[PDB]
Amino acid sequence: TDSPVLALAKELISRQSVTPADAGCQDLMIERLKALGFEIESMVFEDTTNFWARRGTQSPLFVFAGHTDVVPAGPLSQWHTPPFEPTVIDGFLHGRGAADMKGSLACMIVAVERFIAEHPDHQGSIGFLITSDEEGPFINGTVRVVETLMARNELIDMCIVGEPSSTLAVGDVVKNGRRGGGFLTDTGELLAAVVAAVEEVNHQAPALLTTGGTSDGRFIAQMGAQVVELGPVNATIHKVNECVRIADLEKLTDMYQKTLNHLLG
């Protein structure tokens, strides 16, 4: 019986969320978060769907951010497997969005489930900031949501963007935002927690980048949050035969869980 991580990642991969359509991926995530006691606000901007969820009312507010949309498959004759049919071959999960970034999304949900099972009375607060337009021409959701939050004085302290950051092995490389773009005091709390988690799992510190990363993560950073990008191997993103090592999804989930333990446990 599939691990919960593999099961959810397969669910998500079967929904044809070619941008900006969502095929119910956020609804799947929202269902799981409702069970955990998150409040949910779905926000529509242009014809894209987004949501914010939050459990807890105390500082620090830690957020998982990502997107449910994927690029189109491209020419079928080049695929060995159906792009929107999650296919398991010799320990890899093939399908559009397996690496960018439905596998990460599944890991975030299972991590928070596991963390909450162990720490129902955690410190701080956990949030999810999920968009469906990151892979499209018109990348609006994150900016609009962040603005909504900022306007009600709901400031995100720390955020993991689960974009596929890694080269050969999950967690070999992380990307670190400049808080306030380099202009606000930065404790390093998040980076030290994600690094601790990556070392607990891999027994090796990740390599670090301080540049690059998505425009949405950079916006979350500019506005005030410590941000780290950590996710699976990125070799096959936006290529045919996109896939992800399943054991790496299991690891990544543990890394996410250990970060929550460090920050909120």
Residue numbers in the entry: 2 to 266
The authors write:
DapE hydrolyzes N-succinyl-L,L-diaminopimelic acid to L,L-diaminopimelic acid and succinate, is part of a biosynthetic pathway that is the major source of lysine in bacteria, and is essential for cell growth and proliferation. All the DapE enzymes characterized to date belong to the M20 family of dinuclear Zn(II)-dependent metalloproteases. In order to examine the role of the catalytic domain of DapE enzymes and the role of the active site loops, we have engineered the HiDapE and the DapE from Vibrio cholerae (VcDapE) by deleting their dimerization domains. Removal of the dimerization domain in DapE enzymes renders the enzyme inactive, even though the resulting truncated proteins have structures of the catalytic domain that are remarkably similar to WT-DapE and AAP.
The monomeric state of VcDapET was confirmed by SEC (the estimated MW of 28.7 kDa) and DLS measurements (the estimated average MW of 23.2 kDa). Two VcDapET structures were determined, the apo- and the dinuclear Zn(II)-loaded form. The final models for both apo- and Zn(II)-loaded VcDapET included two molecules of the catalytic domain in the asymmetric unit. The two V. cholerae structures are virtually identical and superimpose with the average rmsd of 0.25 Å for 265 equivalent Cα atoms suggesting that binding of Zn(II) does not induce any major structural changes. Since the structures of VcDapET were determined in both the apo- and dinuclear Zn(II)-loaded forms, it is evident that removal of either the dimerization domain or the metal cations does not alter the overall structure of the catalytic domain. Similarly to HiDapET, the most flexible regions of the protein are Region I and Region II. Region I corresponds to the engineered loop (the connector) where the deleted dimerization domain is replaced with two glycines. Region II (residues 210–224) forms a loop overhanging the active site metal ions, which includes residues 211–213 that form part of loop V (vide infra). A change is observed in loop V, which in VcDapET adopts a conformation that is significantly different from the one observed for WT-HiDapE (in HiDapET this loop is disordered). Interestingly, this loop is also partially disordered in the structure of HiDapET, while in VcDapET structures its conformational flexibility is signified by the double conformation of the main chain Gly 213 (peptide flip).
